[PDB]
Amino acid sequence: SLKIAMIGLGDIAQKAYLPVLAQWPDIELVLCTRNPKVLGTLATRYRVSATCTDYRDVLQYGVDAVMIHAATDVHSTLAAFFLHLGIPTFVDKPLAASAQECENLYELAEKHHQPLYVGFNRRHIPLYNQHLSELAQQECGALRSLRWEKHRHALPGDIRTFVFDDFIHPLDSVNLSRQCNLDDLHLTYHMSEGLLARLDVQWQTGDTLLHASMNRQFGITTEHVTASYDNVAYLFDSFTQGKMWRDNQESRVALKDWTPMLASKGFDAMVQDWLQVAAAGKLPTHIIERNLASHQLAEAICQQITQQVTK
Amino acid sequence: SLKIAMIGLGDIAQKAYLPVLAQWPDIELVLCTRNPKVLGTLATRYRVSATCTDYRDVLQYGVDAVMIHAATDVHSTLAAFFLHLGIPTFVDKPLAASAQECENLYELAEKHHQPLYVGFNRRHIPLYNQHLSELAQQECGALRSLRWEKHRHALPGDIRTFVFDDFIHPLDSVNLSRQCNLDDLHLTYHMSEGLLARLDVQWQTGDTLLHASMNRQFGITTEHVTASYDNVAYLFDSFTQGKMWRDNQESRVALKDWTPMLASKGFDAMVQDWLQVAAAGKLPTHIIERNLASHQLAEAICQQITQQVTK
Amino acid sequence: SLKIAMIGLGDIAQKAYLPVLAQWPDIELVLCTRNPKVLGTLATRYRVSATCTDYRDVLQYGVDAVMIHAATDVHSTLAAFFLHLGIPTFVDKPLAASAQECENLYELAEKHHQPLYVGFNRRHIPLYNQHLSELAQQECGALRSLRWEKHRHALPGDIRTFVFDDFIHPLDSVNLSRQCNLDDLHLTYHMSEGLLARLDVQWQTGDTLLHASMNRQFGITTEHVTASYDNVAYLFDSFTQGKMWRDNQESRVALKDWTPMLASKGFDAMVQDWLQVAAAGKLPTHIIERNLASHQLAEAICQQITQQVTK
Amino acid sequence: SLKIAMIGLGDIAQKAYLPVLAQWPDIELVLCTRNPKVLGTLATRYRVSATCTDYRDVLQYGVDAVMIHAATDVHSTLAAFFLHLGIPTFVDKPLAASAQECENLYELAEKHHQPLYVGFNRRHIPLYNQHLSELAQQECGALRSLRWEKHRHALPGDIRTFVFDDFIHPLDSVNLSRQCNLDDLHLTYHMSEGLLARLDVQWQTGDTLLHASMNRQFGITTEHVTASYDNVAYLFDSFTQGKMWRDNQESRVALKDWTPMLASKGFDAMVQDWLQVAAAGKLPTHIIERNLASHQLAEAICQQITQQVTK
């Protein structure tokens, strides 16, 4: 059995995590959030006796690990608190607001031999990891190309936020390699009256061309993933449907009916991994390098665009 | 009314060109090809009188212009010929096997003040030009991105052939900036057992990201075009259908029913542009520069992969 | 705030109802089922105190209503029981294996002035009722036609089960005219080996053509709904996606993102209506009549077939 | 070798027939039509020497067969003129304006022992006859169901024209059992502003449910064909593409690229047949029984509707 604390019950905590762990058997929750009104409503709805208003009062529940869903602003603070207190810590992307804080956090995590899992659901998409072993293995494998497009309609933003809070999803999902700088990388972008409209990062490591694309001034909000091997390719227009091309024939691949929405988006699968990491008390090295790399690449991309625009 | 001579009745000539001109009103055809058997077969099929076997006899019928559909290894020889004799010449892409010859040919055309039209049908695709005026205008306009993909199933080939006889399609089609080198351009490729499998070329001109992609070892033979502007986008999965995305809504855009197949592939629209060009003895400068640019770009790509591969 | 008791925790209960209710706000649950093993397993999973094995002890907790999810052959018993005790009763379709029982149960419920709600989730499909008001309001309105197709791959069965436990879905969903017989109705079917393979019931009410189609020996398992008005049509290939044809144009209509799976299948919407009814001790007349009619029609369909076959 | 005369060069003759027979090998044409202007233009455009302005000045060319593409009101007259003289005749749907006239023309046909081919391209569609052999053989076969929908956006009309000139297509295509009356058949329809808007004819012959529907007041103009066998089904949304459902999996079936438009709509295959019938002088029985049947069923459906709308 496992006991977990959830600090910061905001939009995502309520939209996905809570509903996923609330029904998860053999798991005991310890809800924590500053707003007592919200806290109580939720605790009652999902029948949770372990209530907490001050994240520090969590120590009084001997938890096996905590999950932080609060805003980025208070990520490190809360993360560092449980880490230097010898407690596994889960955190929603982005781990921190800057690459340096990400490095420091992981340093503290190592100085205490504690795991620091960063929530990246797009590494656990059931339909994608089913036809694409590479994504499940987090390697480049036999992939010849992989393009991850996540767009939005009329929704530009400031460089920083755009990259760390949104682009990081396609950027990390495609980061099957461990790209951490802009070396041998091709960064392109457009800007509409002061803001970032579309970002394109693409590079080739080995025999695999990785491409992360985000056009937030697109004609419609949608996310597509295209991957190709030798004489075989897939194109997913969503997380539940797709097309498989082989032998010059096209067929559709899809999740089985009744598969819950939060599962298709990979939260169920991710929590699974998280728990195993929490229980084992250790997160595999490549995952730690994956995490840092993606965050470092974000920083490189930000400073680069910022410098070019300002200059 | 014009009298056009067709030199070199091969595959493309029989499949597209010939059947299109033999339909055009006020046009007299003068078939010409090495093989006398094939000549007579077609001559009978399209009930044409003016038959010839030696391109030199073509002059006898007092032709108003010539259309060369022979192999690439004989374009220069045939083109130069009618150019010296001052006759508007048409040549099916590619113009020549190298940028050197192309440059010569055009220099030769300028000298004799004759038009030299290069057959690029993907600049006349009715459905695309109806929705992307930038293509009809052959400019970048408001385009924020334009991606042209032309894939094939299990069909790798040698650099030269692959680039000059296939990739030249998506490359030129996307080359609205008249690019003629690898300056600030990204080029990725993948060799397979001695052959070129996939080639990806993209660069940013002003506020437009151009991208030509060709995977000759794709899971299926298909050609997709994707264009985007601010808050507007399009994605065509063929020359007859496509999706339009605007106001965060997806609608379908398609070619009128009963549109002849060859017309959908822009052949009629091209022959029309060509006949006017020949009948006017003039060919706009921007078009000439595009032809030249696309060919020099192809040259640059070949003498890049070949060099690298041999290392 | 209501206290609902769920009697009979079978598959449908564990897959949709239980998960939706155990999450519903201001509702205390009282689980009840024969098997004490499953009873406790579920009770632990959804953290519920009010446990019970005999459908009688349920009255002890002073429930405001009961939801019977047991087998069809136990509905009448359970239903009648609480209906007499004067408690709003909910029963998952079908109400009973015969129209007679249905008529009895409703006649009974009318005496005790209690509401008897039947579980027809396909009447609360959020994406369908959002676009087609006729379905929301349960009328024919401007509908010139409505076709509900629900097919299965290689799954024939006996007339009874096929109709009362399956076909009733599409049949009822289309029964917007309260059809309670075979009057001016066209019934068609096919028997594979010794079972019912496909059934097709279609009739016309005024200016509306209704059609229920089920081919349980179809090449694939899917469900398509097609609705048409004057110069307007819709075709949904699922509960989340569909296309709209208007002004000779095709546009995509889809369910908002992050919508829970069960919700898209109209369960949340149905439970809502159910609770309101239960808390109001009243159930609109037009609803009851539709319920009876659909079961009376199912009865009629079963008979004419069984007869015509044995004949 | 063959020589065919074409009487009546309208829009269909110019859009489909002339072009198809213009490149046909071993076939000499004898263009005939009222209007002189049009005539010469076409004779020059397709380079035909055999000109004509009167369907009577036709035997001066010793034709082997004739093709009438004129209006319906002049079909009989012309059809009889050549069947008298003893000439294989080809007529475009509908054969005549009434079932009476059809039987008449067909009685005069066997009277002079001459074939009377009716142009029904929907029987010779390459993509459909490929996967659906029953349509190629023209018999119910193993089909369990076959639905042919042909809708139009905002285009209602008078019963007569709506039926014989348009509905005749789907009605005949699904008529594999030579249905000729309203026996055991289900007919529904809808009128609007005094015109016919939608028409649906459905009946079951053996183990095959055949359904023809046409809603000329649909949201878009499109034609769909659905066909189901035991545990197998096909859905064609066009004449060149479709979906094949088998083993609960969906795959795409389509026409090879570069297949001319007129070929996909079946004109090539039909003409092919038409010729093999003109040369052979004999037309298979079932084909004659089918054509009559379709026109008889057409009349039945007309008078039937005309009566109720009048009663």
Ligand code: NI
């Ligand atoms: Ni409405």
